[PDB]
Design a protein around this motif. Structure first.
Motif, PDB file in Angstrom:
ATOM      1  N   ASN A  43      14.271   2.652  11.536  1.00 30.99           N
ATOM      2  CA  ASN A  43      13.399   2.521  10.240  1.00 30.99           C
ATOM      3  C   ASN A  43      12.505   1.178   9.768  1.00 30.99           C
ATOM      4  O   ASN A  43      12.464   1.098   8.805  1.00 30.99           O
ATOM      5  CB  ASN A  43      13.899   3.346   9.529  1.00 30.99           C
ATOM      6  CG  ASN A  43      14.814   4.305   9.905  1.00 30.99           C
ATOM      7  OD1 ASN A  43      13.908   5.284  10.166  1.00 30.99           O
ATOM      8  ND2 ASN A  43      16.024   3.897   9.947  1.00 30.99           N
ATOM      9  N   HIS A  81       9.419   3.680   5.319  1.00 33.21           N
ATOM     10  CA  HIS A  81       9.510   4.832   5.908  1.00 33.21           C
ATOM     11  C   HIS A  81      10.592   5.333   6.738  1.00 33.21           C
ATOM     12  O   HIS A  81      11.640   4.940   6.794  1.00 33.21           O
ATOM     13  CB  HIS A  81       7.581   4.695   6.636  1.00 33.21           C
ATOM     14  CG  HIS A  81       8.354   3.495   8.078  1.00 33.21           C
ATOM     15  ND1 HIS A  81       8.752   2.089   7.818  1.00 33.21           N
ATOM     16  CD2 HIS A  81       7.839   3.354   9.306  1.00 33.21           C
ATOM     17  CE1 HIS A  81       8.776   1.394   8.991  1.00 33.21           C
ATOM     18  NE2 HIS A  81       9.027   2.286   9.793  1.00 33.21           N
ATOM     19  N   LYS A  82      10.580   6.653   7.864  1.00 36.31           N
ATOM     20  CA  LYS A  82      11.305   6.701   8.581  1.00 36.31           C
ATOM     21  C   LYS A  82      10.978   7.051  10.094  1.00 36.31           C
ATOM     22  O   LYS A  82       9.903   7.206  10.374  1.00 36.31           O
ATOM     23  CB  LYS A  82      11.695   8.383   8.290  1.00 36.31           C
ATOM     24  CG  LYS A  82      13.107   9.169   8.123  1.00 36.31           C
ATOM     25  CD  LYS A  82      13.322   9.463  10.001  1.00 36.31           C
ATOM     26  CE  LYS A  82      13.983  10.668   9.794  1.00 36.31           C
ATOM     27  NZ  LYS A  82      13.643  10.683  11.452  1.00 36.31           N
ATOM     28  N   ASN A  83      11.825   6.182  11.235  1.00 37.67           N
ATOM     29  CA  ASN A  83      11.319   5.857  12.347  1.00 37.67           C
ATOM     30  C   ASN A  83      12.438   5.926  13.166  1.00 37.67           C
ATOM     31  O   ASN A  83      12.808   4.508  13.588  1.00 37.67           O
ATOM     32  CB  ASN A  83      10.202   4.963  12.202  1.00 37.67           C
ATOM     33  CG  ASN A  83       9.595   4.781  13.969  1.00 37.67           C
ATOM     34  OD1 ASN A  83       9.187   3.318  14.371  1.00 37.67           O
ATOM     35  ND2 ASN A  83       9.927   5.932  14.453  1.00 37.67           N
ATOM     36  N   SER A  99       1.636   2.229   9.199  1.00 37.96           N
ATOM     37  CA  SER A  99       2.123   3.476  10.146  1.00 37.96           C
ATOM     38  C   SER A  99       2.179   4.288   9.974  1.00 37.96           C
ATOM     39  O   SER A  99       1.898   4.917   8.790  1.00 37.96           O
ATOM     40  CB  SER A  99       3.612   2.799   9.643  1.00 37.96           C
ATOM     41  OG  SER A  99       4.070   3.399  11.453  1.00 37.96           O
ATOM     42  N   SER A 130       4.628   7.862  10.426  1.00 36.32           N
ATOM     43  CA  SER A 130       6.238   8.115   9.643  1.00 36.32           C
ATOM     44  C   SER A 130       6.724   9.525   9.437  1.00 36.32           C
ATOM     45  O   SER A 130       6.587  10.658  10.116  1.00 36.32           O
ATOM     46  CB  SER A 130       6.488   7.697   7.647  1.00 36.32           C
ATOM     47  OG  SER A 130       7.915   8.185   7.496  1.00 36.32           O
ATOM     48  N   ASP A 184       8.415  11.598   8.041  1.00 37.41           N
ATOM     49  CA  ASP A 184       8.991  12.154   7.024  1.00 37.41           C
ATOM     50  C   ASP A 184       7.344  12.972   6.614  1.00 37.41           C
ATOM     51  O   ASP A 184       7.287  13.152   5.401  1.00 37.41           O
ATOM     52  CB  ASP A 184       9.021  11.427   5.603  1.00 37.41           C
ATOM     53  CG  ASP A 184       8.485   9.771   5.486  1.00 37.41           C
ATOM     54  OD1 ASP A 184       7.371   9.854   6.125  1.00 37.41           O
ATOM     55  OD2 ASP A 184       8.937   9.369   4.398  1.00 37.41           O
ATOM     56  N   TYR A 194       2.097   5.906   5.745  1.00 34.87           N
ATOM     57  CA  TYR A 194       2.181   4.231   4.785  1.00 34.87           C
ATOM     58  C   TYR A 194       1.822   2.773   5.058  1.00 34.87           C
ATOM     59  O   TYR A 194       1.036   2.773   5.882  1.00 34.87           O
ATOM     60  CB  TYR A 194       3.879   3.456   5.624  1.00 34.87           C
ATOM     61  CG  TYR A 194       5.433   4.746   5.101  1.00 34.87           C
ATOM     62  CD1 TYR A 194       5.591   6.175   5.401  1.00 34.87           C
ATOM     63  CD2 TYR A 194       5.785   3.465   3.674  1.00 34.87           C
ATOM     64  CE1 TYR A 194       6.214   7.100   4.724  1.00 34.87           C
ATOM     65  CE2 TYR A 194       6.584   5.351   3.209  1.00 34.87           C
ATOM     66  CZ  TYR A 194       6.613   6.694   4.497  1.00 34.87           C
ATOM     67  OH  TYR A 194       8.038   7.376   3.292  1.00 34.87           O
ATOM     68  N   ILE A 244       4.450  -1.936  -0.152  1.00 30.12           N
ATOM     69  CA  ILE A 244       4.366   0.037   0.211  1.00 30.12           C
ATOM     70  C   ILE A 244       2.846  -0.336  -0.892  1.00 30.12           C
ATOM     71  O   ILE A 244       3.277  -0.055  -1.856  1.00 30.12           O
ATOM     72  CB  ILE A 244       4.987   0.916   0.118  1.00 30.12           C
ATOM     73  CG1 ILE A 244       6.470   1.228   1.357  1.00 30.12           C
ATOM     74  CG2 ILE A 244       4.454   2.093   0.261  1.00 30.12           C
ATOM     75  CD1 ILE A 244       7.234   1.710   1.057  1.00 30.12           C
ATOM     76  N   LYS A 270       0.770   5.311  -0.137  1.00 29.22           N
ATOM     77  CA  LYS A 270       1.597   6.391   1.023  1.00 29.22           C
ATOM     78  C   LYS A 270       0.380   7.872   1.553  1.00 29.22           C
ATOM     79  O   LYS A 270       0.340   8.611   0.181  1.00 29.22           O
ATOM     80  CB  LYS A 270       2.712   6.617   0.348  1.00 29.22           C
ATOM     81  CG  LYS A 270       3.951   6.461   0.846  1.00 29.22           C
ATOM     82  CD  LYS A 270       4.563   6.022  -0.445  1.00 29.22           C
ATOM     83  CE  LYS A 270       6.276   7.461  -0.047  1.00 29.22           C
ATOM     84  NZ  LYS A 270       7.376   7.108  -0.587  1.00 29.22           N
TER      85      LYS A 270
END
Ligand SMILES: Cc1cccc(C(=O)Nc2cc(-c3cnc4ccccc4c3)ccc2N2CCN(C)CC2)c1
Ligand SMILES: [Cl-]
Length: 304
Positions: free
Chosen positions: A206, A225-227, A246, A248, A250, A254, A263, A266
């Motif tokens: 992430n 973010h989620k990665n 980027s 993500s 979710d 982002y 951030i 979003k």
């Protein structure tokens, strides 16, 4: 200072997961690639579908444009890359040599070379004109996730699931620098900054990192973010404010302030993992693309 990206278009047409979206260097077009084995071309400013390009026998992970916005190269699970004439839709060369899925590709700025990365753990450098493989770099010890030339084409950066990011001398094929991390999470994405002085790298914990290439030092980290599963493409946005962009896991895009790492936006709307984002060369425009429960590309526009 924050951007205000708002949804402009949703581009439907791909029948399976979208893998990659890229704006042409001349700003005219967006190209997309997909698990459906198709490349689609769309108008960058009105989102209008242009044409479907076909020939790959299996899914396509990546597509990249030549400097003159006239050629495209694609990287497929069928273990080939193909060079296409954008205006005719015809396959000009089939680049054979990888022993497994090809995941990533790019022209050099001069657009006489193509670099590719594969599941086979190698980076290949190809002659555009003849289609012949010029060099095979024993680049990595796991699938290669990304390959990119710097501004003058004199360097290549590569990333791999082996946890490393390597910098190669294009001419000789020699490794000049390895970026290593103590925990070595898979490196799922890498790209040079527009000026070539920095590298942006994603890891599957992430995290995005900005590395001083010249010194081998991490200057910034971007999180929130989620990665942790997908090779999600990230970007420098330089047309307005100086952002990092980027996808993500979710389903959001982002946007971070490059210097502060905060951030700043979003982008909501996708219904699956946003695996690809692209930033327009001249306008404050983002393209984003999502996986099989979405299958669409979105175009977003900002005042800065
Ligand atoms: C056809 C298609 C449609 C939608 C998504 C993908 C995909 O995710 N690509 C891919 C996969 C992999 C990959 C596949 N197996 C693996 C197995 C073991 C270890 C590592 C592995 C890495 C790596 C990169 C990439 N890409 C993502 C899109 N991007 C524009 C370039 C790179 C492809
Ligand atoms: Cl790119």
């Amino acid at each position: 200072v924050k951007p205000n990206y708002a949804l402009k278009f949703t581009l439907a047409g791909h029948t399976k997961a979208v893998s990659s979206v890229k704006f042409s260097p001349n700003g005219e077009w967006l190209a997309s690639s997909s698990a459906d084995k198709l490349i689609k071309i769309w108008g960058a400013y009105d989102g209008k579908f242009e044409k479907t390009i076909s020939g790959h026998k299996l899914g396509i992970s990546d597509v990249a444009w030549s400097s003159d916005s006239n050629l495209l190269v694609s990287a497929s699970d069928d273990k080939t890359l193909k060079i296409w004439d954008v205006s005719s839709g015809k396959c000009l060369k089939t680049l054979k040599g990888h022993s497994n899925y090809v995941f990533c590709c790019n022209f050099n700025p001069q657009s006489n070379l193509i670099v590719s990365g594969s599941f086979d753990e190698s980076v290949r450098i190809w002659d555009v004109k003849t289609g012949k493989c010029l060099k095979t770099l024993p680049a990595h010890s796991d699938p290669v996730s990304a390959v990119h030339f710097n501004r003058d084409g004199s360097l290549i950066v590569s990333s791999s699931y082996d946890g490393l990011c390597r910098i190669w001398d294009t001419a000789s094929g020699q490794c000049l620098k390895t970026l290593i991390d103590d925990d070595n999470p898979p490196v799922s994405f890498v790209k040079f900054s527009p000026n070539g002085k920095y590298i942006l790298a994603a890891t599957l914990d992430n995290t995005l990192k900005l590395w001083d290439y010249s010194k081998g030092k991490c200057l910034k980290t971007y999180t929130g973010h989620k990665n942790e599963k997908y090779c999600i493409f990230a970007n420098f946005s330089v047309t307005g404010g100086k952002w990092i962009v980027s996808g993500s896991e979710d389903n959001l895009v982002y946007i971070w302030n490059l210097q502060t790492k905060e951030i700043v936006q979003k982008l909501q709307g996708h219904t699956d993992v946003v695996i690809s984002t692209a930033c327009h060369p001249t306008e404050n425009i983002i393209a984003s693309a999502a996986l099989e429960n979405d299958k669409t590309i979105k175009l977003w526009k900002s005042d800065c």
